[PDB]
Each structure stands twice: as C-alpha cells, then as structure tokens.
Amino acid sequence: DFDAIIIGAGFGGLYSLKKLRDDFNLKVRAFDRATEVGGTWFWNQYPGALSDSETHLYCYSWDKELLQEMEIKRKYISQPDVLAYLKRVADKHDLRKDIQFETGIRSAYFDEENSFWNVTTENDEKFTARFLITALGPLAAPNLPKIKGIETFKGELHHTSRWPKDVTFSGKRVGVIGTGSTGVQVITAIASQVKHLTVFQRSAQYSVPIGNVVMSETDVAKIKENYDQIWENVWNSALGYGLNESTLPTMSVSAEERDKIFEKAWQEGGGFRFMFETFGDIAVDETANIEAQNFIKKKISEIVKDPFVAKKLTPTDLYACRPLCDSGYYEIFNRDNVSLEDVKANPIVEIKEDCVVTADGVEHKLDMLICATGFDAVDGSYKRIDIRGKDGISIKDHWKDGPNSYLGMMVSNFPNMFMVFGPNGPLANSPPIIETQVRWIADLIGYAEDHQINQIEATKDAVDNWTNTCSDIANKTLFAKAKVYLYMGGLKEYRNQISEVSNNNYKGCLLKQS
Ligand SMILES: Cc1cc2nc3c(=O)[nH]c(=O)nc-3n(C[C@H](O)[C@H](O)[C@H](O)COP(=O)(O)OP(=O)(O)OC[C@H]3O[C@@H](n4cnc5c(N)ncnc54)[C@H](O)[C@@H]3O)c2cc1C
Ligand SMILES: NC(=O)C1=CN([C@@H]2O[C@H](COP(=O)(O)OP(=O)(O)OC[C@H]3O[C@@H](n4cnc5c(N)ncnc54)[C@H](OP(=O)(O)O)[C@@H]3O)[C@@H](O)[C@H]2O)C=CC1
C-alpha cells in the first residue's frame, strides 16, 4: 500500500515525489527503468545534446536555496550538466530512498471496488496505491527508419536515444539520417571529428543560432540577484523562456526596421526568441511568417558558399513552424569532408553490410550510421503500458484516435490517475509546466484527504470541453497549416484555466466519498 505511485524519475517524477511525500506527508513510491534519476537527460547522451531553454530557466524554481547554489556555466546547459543538476536535487532532498530503479511498470489496473490502482512491475511485483502519477515524458519509443536491409549493416548503427559510451569518430566515414533538432545537434558536433560526414536529409528545416556562450561571474550575479522577478516573469508569460514576448505586427514596420529586429534576435540566439520576441504574429499571419522565412533563407544563402548546397538546405514549405536552433549547423556544409544528400529527391532504397544505397544506385560507404529519426508521439509512452481504468478499457483503446484529456492531467474513465507533462498540455518551457501541474495535482490530492474523497475522475464532457478550447486556439494559428495535441494559449493562460477549475470545486471532476 502507498498513497501514490509515480512512474518516472525525470523532472516530472522527481518533483511529484518531493511534493507528495514531503509537503503532503503521503507514502509514495516512484519507479523508473533507469539506474539513476534524470529521465530523458539520463537516456539521451548523444553528441551535442543541449537544452533549448537558457540554463537559468531550465531548472526548478521551488527551491530558492538551490537557485542560489546552482552552477550557471554556459548560457544553455549540456546533457551531463542537466544530469548532474537532477542528481543534486535528488541528493539534497533525499529522494532516491523512495525510488525503485531498474524497474519497468508493465500494467496498472484500476480497482473500482477498492478505488485504488493495482500496479505490476515487469518482474511480476504488485503494489497498490490510491493515486497513480504518470510522469512519462514527451518521448515514446524510438523511431528507426524502415529501410530494406538495415539489419545487414555490419558497422556501427545507433539511434540517438541509445547512444553508447566510448564512441570514437576519428578516421571514420559517418552518416546521419535526420535533420531535426537532434540531427542538427549531432551533425554540428561531430562534423569536425569524422573523416567524412554524409547527411541524409529528407526535409530541410529552418534553424537559428542558439548563441551558447560562457557565463561570466557578473552575468551569473545579475541573474541570481534578480531571480525572484525572473520567475515572476516566467509565470506571467506565454512561453516561460524569459523572452520579451512581442505584440508588434511584423508588417507594421519598414523593411529596414524589420531586418534590424530579426538581426537582433539572430545575434542573441534562440528559436523561440526568433519567432516570438521579434514580432507577435509570425505564427498567425501568413505574410508575417513568410517574412521570417525569407530572413533565414537569406542567412543560409550568405553562410554556405556553394549556392547549390544552399538551395538543398533551404526549406520548401510555404509556411514555417518552430525553427530549430544550432551552434554552427549551416557552416558545417562548407567543410571539404561533408556531403549533403537530398533523400526526398534521391531516396534511400537499401542499406548493405558496408553502405547506404540511394535510388541513383550510389553506395555511400559508411563505418557508422546515426539514426536521428525521432520518436513516436507522446501518447505512445502511455499506450506502451497496460493501463486499464473503469470497466477495464485500456488507454490503448481509449486513445485509439489520439490523446484527449482534461487540462492535460486527467483522462476520462481513468480515475485517480494524474499525468505530469502529459498530452493536451501547454506549449512552453517544460520545467515551469511540470511545476504547475505537480502543484495542481498535489493540491487536489490534499483536497481529497481533507474531505475524505477517494475517487477523482474527469467527466467525458470536461474532456471534450478541453479538446474544444485547444482546437479553437490552435485553428487561429499557422501551426495547423504546416507540419499529438497541445494547448496553445500559453503558460499564463493555462495557469488561469486550471486555477478556475480548482477555485470552482474542481468543476468537471467527479468526487466520490466513502
Ligand atoms: C536534448 C534535449 C533538450 C531539451 N530541451 C528542452 C528545453 O529547452 N525546453 C523544454 O521545455 N523541453 C526540452 N526538452 C524536452 C524534455 O523531455 C523535457 O524538458 C523534460 O526533460 C521532460 O521531463 P519529464 O520528467 O517530464 O520526462 P522524462 O525526462 O522523459 O522522464 C520519463 C521517465 O519515465 C520513465 N518511464 C516511462 N515509462 C516507464 C515505465 N512503464 N516504467 C518505468 N519507467 C518508465 C523513463 O524511463 C524516463 O526515465 C529537451 C529534450 C532533450 C532530449
Ligand atoms: N533542444 C531540444 O529542446 C530538443 C528537443 N527535441 C524534441 O524531441 C523531438 C524529437 O526531435 P528529433 O529527435 O529531431 O526527431 P524529429 O522527429 O524532430 O526529426 C526527425 C528527423 O528524422 C527524419 N526522418 C524520420 N524518419 C525518416 C526516414 N524513415 N527516412 C529518412 N529520414 C527520416 C525526419 O525527416 P522528415 O522531417 O522528412 O520526417 C526529421 O528530419 C522533437 O519534437 C523536438 O522538439 C529533441 C532534441 C533536442
């Protein structure tokens, strides 16, 4: 018996355990397949792994002593340093004693008679808990490219999510499939280290500089002496990235001023900065969106000197979503040892024991093939668990057509289950999202113990309500006209929404007593 069981020991799971155990005095147990805390920051160890959020905001806000103690080494934070940070959080707050590592959860069945959850590990260990906290993260199963003969490769073959230790690059011909956020980071990091690099690009994306620089002691003092206001700005923002979120229409200024504003963001760095600190309608107005695209296209044409390589790197879609961010990606393609293959025009048709074969018949001989090919959608981590709620319906069947939920934290037909960083949540910096959701869930659980209620479930109508406001907001935005579900109202408005619920006797939830 526990009051609550937590699945996950990343950002979301660690704060779930701290809040429920230490601030609400509940008996809690957390589970993770990993051998150590960190979640994705433990698993994902590929070359160039780096946060999109600046270091001073990609962390917890609730421990004011930790904020003053925190190492702020560079403007953005690398994977080993995030892992060290989360390890420090677990050390200080004595969290590992209530985490069972090396333990996967195979099934969670709701007991409508007892109003609690039956949780079974992959090693046939069974536990009971009133509440189930799922902190599964945004990444589901790794997506490997389905290419004929991929199993015949005799060289080194790795998905970026399973990057091994001790990988050496010198003297090797290396290929990378994928030019998303992960592919851009890997390509930029290893191009100077390999004998030759082939990039297999199916769809070119826009990328802006991240501007990762060392932080002076004065830089760090400016942050730490003003940390209270910094976090106040995060909670009062849409994105939680510390940006000066613009309301200025793109076309409302001259072409000269518009170039100056984009260049200012380009120099300071950041993908969210480029869309949302420059102007306020780049994700809404088609003409504004094209203006943002053309600036980056001009940058690509200026950086990469071979015009034909520049064209291959230039995105073709009419409208643009999130720009990537990089630490020198486009410059990579000026190198003598880098080849760019347009795999939309020249698809990969086969790979053999020593090569990747394109449709033109060319054998690209490789010692190592890196698959930066992404993951399944976020609900896949839930579908991967045998979660059964009321009447025995499984989350696999309940979400056969995609995820739907109430406020991004409760699922109809699944009582006493609360998701942290689950689907249908806000589009913002994730640590502020996770802190908001954990505090909201913990307040609801505390409200449950105070009023002797032992079953909490969101109604079907509340779920469809939440789906409606998400679809309404999303359809005002170009994110539907371009390249599984998000609330796009921002962190501030998201916090207003869930506050209205908790302030009105948890409107939309069923609360059973006993
Ligand atoms: C390089 C990189 C940079 C990023 N930068 C940003 C950024 O700037 N801003 C941002 O908002 N987001 C960013 N992200 C996204 C990132 O996933 C989140 O910021 C955050 O780490 C999510 O934490 P989490 O605890 O919610 O999930 P995770 O860290 O993914 O933790 C999930 C954990 O649950 C465990 N688990 C899952 N299923 C089971 C099961 N059945 N049994 C047992 N254990 C299970 C997993 O093993 C894992 O340890 C970045 C991601 C990467 C990889
Ligand atoms: N710094 C950060 O905050 C980071 C965040 N992330 C997040 O995690 C998620 C994953 O990012 P990423 O790991 O880049 O995965 P993505 O899905 O974002 O990028 C996948 C890449 O692989 C290519 N690809 C996929 N399947 C094939 C195939 N069969 N043949 C050829 N090419 C293929 C895609 O091309 P196409 O576009 O043509 O499908 C795309 O270029 C993203 O949502 C991102 O936001 C990840 C890393 C860093």
Tokens representing 294?
């053309």
CA 11 to mean position of chain CA atoms = 11
Q: Angle CA(505)–CA(511)–CA(514) in degrees, nearest 5?
A: 130
Residue showing tokens 């923002």: 237
- Expressed in angstroms and rounded, the spacing between residue 41 Cα and the centre of ligand 1 is 7
Distance CA 240, CA 229 (A): 13
Burial 17-37 (b: 16+ CB within 10 A, else e): bbbbbeeeebebbbbbebeeb
SS3 annotation, 261-291 = HHHHHHHHCCHHHHHHCCCCCCCCCHHHHHH
Residue showing tokens 């429920």: 20
Distance CA 159, CA 374 (A): 9
Distance CA 153, CA 144 (A): 14
Distance CA 303, CA 307 (A): 10
Beta-carbon neighbour count of residue 145 at 10 Å? 17
Distance CA 237, CA 241 (A): 8
How far lies 432's CA from each of 56, 57, 59, 61, in Å?
12, 8, 8, 8
**Ligand 1 site, residue 58, Cβ cutoff 6 A:** yes
Own/partner pairs for 476-483, CB < 8 Å, 24+ apart?
A: 476/284, 477/283, 477/284, 478/283, 478/284, 478/285, 478/286, 478/289, 478/319, 478/321, 479/283, 479/321, 481/319, 482/317, 482/319, 482/320, 482/321, 483/317, 483/321
* Residue 437 CB burial class (10 angstroms; 0-12, 13-18, ≥19): buried
Q: CATH topology for 2-37+95-141+377-513?
A: FAD/NAD(P)-binding domain (3.50.50)
- Expressed in angstroms and rounded, the spacing between residue 484 Cα and the centre of ligand 2 is 14
Tokens representing 303?
């950086």
Cα-Cα end-to-end distance for the chain: 18
Distance CA 128, CA 114 (A): 10
Distance CA 16, CA 320 (A): 36
Tokens representing 273?
């900065």
Q: What is the DSSP letter of 115?
A: T
Number of residues that make up the chain: 514
Contact 129, 117 (CB under 8 A): yes
Beta pairing class for 105-111 and 99-100: unpaired
Q: Say which residues have a Cβ less than 8 Å from residue 222's Cβ, sequence separation at least 6.
A: none
Tokens representing 292?
């943002």
Tokens representing 38?
């960190």
Tokens representing 277?
């600190």
Beta-carbon neighbour count of residue 122 at 10 Å? 13
Tokens representing 94?
């004595």
Distance CA 98, CA 296 (A): 48
Beta pairing class for 355-358 and 348-352: antiparallel
Residue showing tokens 């994902």: 44
Tokens representing 123?
């090693």
Contact 14, 89 (CB under 8 A): yes
Best residue for ligand 1 mutational test, from 40, 61, 100 (most atoms within 8 Å of Cβ):
40
Q: Which ligand is nearest to the CA of 15?
A: 1
DSSP assignments along 38-101, one per residue: -THHHH---TT-EEEEETTTSS-SS-HHHHHH----BSEEEHHHHHHHHHHHHHHTT-GGGEE-
Distance CA 208, CA 292 (A): 11
Residue showing tokens 């005799």: 154
Contact 429, 492 (CB under 8 A): no
Kindly provide the residue ranges of all beta strands, DSSP E only, lying in 122-202, ordered along the sequence. Answer: 126-134, 156-159, 173-177, 196-201
Amino acid at 329: Y
- Where along the chain do its domains lie? 2-37+95-141+377-513, 173-371
DSSP assignments along 382-445, one per residue: HHTSEEE-GGG-BHHHHTTT----BTTTBBTTBTTEEESS-SSEESS-HHHHHHHHHHHHHHHH
**Which value in Å is the resolution of this experimental model?**
1.8
Distance CA 497, CA 487 (A): 11
Count of CA atoms in the C-beta half-sphere (13 A) of 203: 10
Beta-carbon neighbour count of residue 425 at 10 Å? 25
| Method by which the model was determined | X-ray
Tokens representing 340?
């760019």
Contact 60, 435 (CB under 8 A): yes
Taking alpha carbons only, the member of 10, 20, 280, 324 closest to residue 138 is 10
Residue showing tokens 């073959």: 157
How far lies 403's CA from each of 10, 221, 373, 387, in Å?
22, 43, 22, 14
How far lies 326's CA from each of 161, 182, 438, 504, in Å?
19, 10, 31, 45
Atom number in ligand 2 closest to CA 203: 38
Helix (H) or strand (E) holding 301, with range, is helix 286-303
Count of CA atoms in the C-beta half-sphere (13 A) of 189: 18
Distance CA 419, CA 426 (A): 13
* Residue 328 CB burial class (10 angstroms; 0-12, 13-18, ≥19): middle
Distance CA 148, CA 359 (A): 12
Residue showing tokens 């990747």: 356
Residue showing tokens 């940006």: 243
Distance CA 92, CA 84 (A): 12
Own/partner pairs for 276-281, CB < 8 Å, 24+ apart?
A: 276/238, 276/239, 276/243, 276/245, 276/246, 277/243, 277/244, 277/245, 277/246, 278/246, 278/248, 278/250, 279/246, 279/248, 279/249, 279/250, 280/245, 280/246, 280/247, 280/248, 280/249, 281/249, 281/250
**Ligand 1 site, residue 315, Cβ cutoff 6 A:** no
Taking alpha carbons only, the member of 223, 184, 221, 232 closest to residue 204 is 184
Q: Say which residues have a Cβ less than 8 Å from residue 250's Cβ, sequence separation at least 6.
A: 258, 278, 279, 281, 282, 285, 287, 288, 291, 292
Contact 343, 201 (CB under 8 A): yes
Percentage helix, strand, coil for the chain under 3-state DSSP, each rounded to 5: 35, 20, 40
Paired strand residues for 458: 509
3-state SS assignment for residue 167: coil
- Expressed in angstroms and rounded, the spacing between residue 180 Cα and the centre of ligand 2 is 4
- Using CB distances shorter than 6 Å, the residues near ligand 2 are 50, 52, 145, 177-183, 202-203, 343, 372-375
Distance CA 200, CA 356 (A): 10
Distance CA 201, CA 477 (A): 27
**What are the backbone dihedrals phi and psi of residue 357, each rounded to the nearest 5 degrees, phi first?**
-110, 125
Beta pairing class for 453-458 and 509-513: antiparallel
- Expressed in angstroms and rounded, the spacing between residue 337 Cα and the centre of ligand 1 is 34
Beta-carbon neighbour count of residue 441 at 10 Å? 23
Residue showing tokens 């601030």: 23
Tokens representing 205?
């994306």
Distance CA 419, CA 463 (A): 14
3-state SS assignment for residue 356: strand
Q: Whose CA is nearest to atom 9 of ligand 2?
A: 374
Q: Which ligand is nearest to the CA of 58?
A: 1
